[PDB]
Structure 1
């Protein structure tokens, strides 16, 4: 974190374009610049120095010079003062409320935590739970708690069927000392790219986890993806653990590597890798890596038997999960 001041600035600028301006490309431009600068092993001394890095252009370089000289950015100082922008940025922090709903509520005058609570009636199910656990979802999860959660998930899944294989991905698999949430990749021999010999595969698991009171709420749920809430059990007289966000993805067993690659992230890593893939003439999703014909249309899935095989197709040396945190 040699350039934390600069990266935080780029991140605030990113959120602004995302939440207020609804300009996703500017959002990603800022995030890319922040990321590349985050792994830069030197304390940046000038906008020009930073401009040498890919993803950092003239505009961002000018802002870096402003930030390095004054220790702040006028554009942000003004944005921070703007009531609408402020309110819109804040509301988007509730899970379920994005830029559109945020601006929408702000129009109606609903712009504070208090306002949301006195208007639950104006929230869909997901946004309702997000408000309920607003404080909790703001908290980080120490890796030690992730370990306890991992144990519960793997053992409970094993109890449903010994053939299930639950792998904890996301930032956890990347070695992080704390996570924003828990992401679980699920596989079972009965569900392959070729067939679904068994129904309720994901349901059974969700059900069992709810049975033992690990999963407390549901944000969204389908046959292959579950997005909800969970909580570690506390001992007698012991304060309860904060509620945690949990995501579970059931992927075809034979497409495991593409699935684990995707779910391990990071999101920026995935976007960079998938983009590189396109330039190399391939397309990558959580199921497969396919070549791109002359027309540009995806071809048939190429054989994959490891994460490395995917890296090899696009001519990228293998990168351990811990080195994919972009």
Structure 2
């Protein structure tokens, strides 16, 4: 399916380098180019052809042809020797490019250096100790078990609750880097107060081991980001997200948390070109603005009972989860 593998592998290396260095826009640009290459119907055979692909410009075309005709990309030999370390540091949940840069300027070079000498935020300390477990993508089965665990715990409070694992799991991938469980209820009200009760229950059985983000001093359209671990010998710690939402937002939440991230932003961009706005909450008319183009409030929500409804209103052919990698 990817006729340009020999090419996308090389471009991915540069993209990642720019990314870990904080050059976010340059990296986003590469991503869209790389994605466009992956979906191209055949191997790219010329500069002109490459440039013709939406998402690929002169700069990228030039590199593509260089790889195509020589089998290599010289720019790769000129990547700063600091990239591997910056990557290692930003692999720690809670630590981004700014923190990786700080640690590198202070002279740190290994996870051991970070452990013994770096100032760590509460979230980062958790990210560090579970570094390896978090970098390992778990097999689909485990994801299923984690999702079932959350479902049973929630349904024990209200059998009507609907629980759905999204992210890569819903996109049908064989391995998952995390598990995101979306919860709601058909009656449009019984989702209230589930968060608190659900968390304490999961903590009761030792399933939840660490909390990264969880504002339990607020009961509104919530989110929990933490660490879970299935009972039983040898089980690793895994990243678990729990989002509880009202029934009216279910479709957009399902669409957003299923992803991918590239797909979400592409859809949102597309929504704006049609005078609309897409968020994990809803599909609305264009947001309201002030004299100087400043946003002074939300647009009007357009009811979307199902994901199909979002595509319909955007004038786009429906896409199944497995087809949303970008």
Normalising by structure 1, report the TM-score: 0.89
SS in 1 for 2:267: helix
What are the equivalent positions in structure 2 for 1:241-320 lying under 5 Å apart? 241-292=235-286, 298-320=298-320
Instruction: Determine whether 1:176 maps to 2:173.
Output: yes
The answer to which of 277-286 and 247-256 deviates more is 247-256
C-alpha spacing 1:107/1:153, structure 2 compared with 1 (3 Å): same
Q: Hey, what's the Cα distance between the residues in 2 that align with 1:119 and 1:293?
A: 47
CA contact (8 A) 1:10 1:34 kept: yes
Write the mapping of 1:97-108 to structure 2, written as runs, cut at 5 A: 97-108=95-106
Match of 2:227 among 226, 229, 244: 229
Asked if the contact 1:47/1:60 (under 8 Å) is kept, the reply is: no
Q: CA, structure 1 residues 114+198, in 2 after alignment: closer, same or farther (shift >3 Å)?
A: same
Partner Cα distance (2:147, 2:288) in 1: 45
Query: 1: distance between equivalents of 2:197 and 2:142?
Result: 24
Label 1:262 to 1:47 Cα distance change in 2 as closer, same or farther (>3 A). same
> Aligned equivalents of 1:140 and 1:32: distance in 2?
24
Structure 1 residues 174-210: Cα deviation after superposition (integer angstroms, max 9, x where no partner): 1111111101112246876xxx9944x3122122122
Deviation at 1:46, TM superposition (A): 4.2
Report matched runs for 1:100-249 at 5 Å.
100-119=98-117, 122-188=119-185, 198-199=192-193, 201-223=194-216, 224-234=222-232, 238=233, 240-249=234-243
Farther-moved stretch of structure 1 (223-232 vs 41-50): 41-50
State the shift of 1:90 in Å.
2.1
Structure 1 segments of 4 or more deviating over 4 A? 188-192, 196-199, 293-298
In 2, the alpha carbon distance for the partners of 1:111 and 1:314 equals 48
Check conservation: 2:161, 2:191, Cα contact below 8 A: no
Measured after TM superposition, the shift of residue 57 of structure 1 is 0.8
Q: Distance in 1 between matches of 2:27 and 2:159?
A: 43
Q: Cα 1:53–1:127, aligned 2, differ >3 Å: closer, same or farther?
A: same
Residue 42 of structure 1 and its aligned partner are, at CA, apart by 2.0
Counterpart CA distance in 2 for 1:66 and 1:325 is: 27
Distance 2:87 2:191 in 1: 45
Q: Determine the C-alpha separation between the residues in 2 that align with 1:144 and 1:3.
A: 31
CA RMSD of aligned residues (A): 2.2
Q: Aligned pair in 2 of structure 1 residues 207, 71: CA closer, same or farther (>3 Å)?
A: farther
Q: Distance in 1 between matches of 2:91 and 2:162?
A: 33
- What's the secondary structure of 1:245's corresponding residue? strand
Superposition deviation, residue 323 in structure 1: 1.2
> 1:168, CA displacement in angstroms?
0.6
Quote the residue 2:219 is aligned against: none
User: Is the CA contact (8 Å cut-off) linking 2:276 and 2:283 kept in structure 1?
Assistant: yes
After superposition, the Cα gap between the structure-2 partners of 1:59 and 1:164, relative to the gap in structure 1 and judged at 3 Å, is: same
Q: What corresponds to 1:3 in structure 2?
A: 4
Q: Secondary structure at the match of 1:63?
A: helix
> 1:11-36, CA deviations, whole angstroms, 9 ceiling, x for partnerless residues?
2222222221x222211111111112
The residue that corresponds to 2:34 in the other structure is 34
C-alpha change, 1:2 and 1:207, in structure 2 (3 Å) is farther
* 1:57 alignment partner in structure 2: 57
CA distance 1:281–1:211, change in 2 (3 Å): same
1:88-103 equivalences in 2 (<5 Å) = 88-103=86-101
Change (3 A) 1:311 1:128: same
In structure 2, how many angstroms separate the alpha carbons of the residues matched to 1:70 and 1:92?
A: 32
- Runs of at least 5 residues in structure 2 that lack an aligned partner in the other structure: 217-221
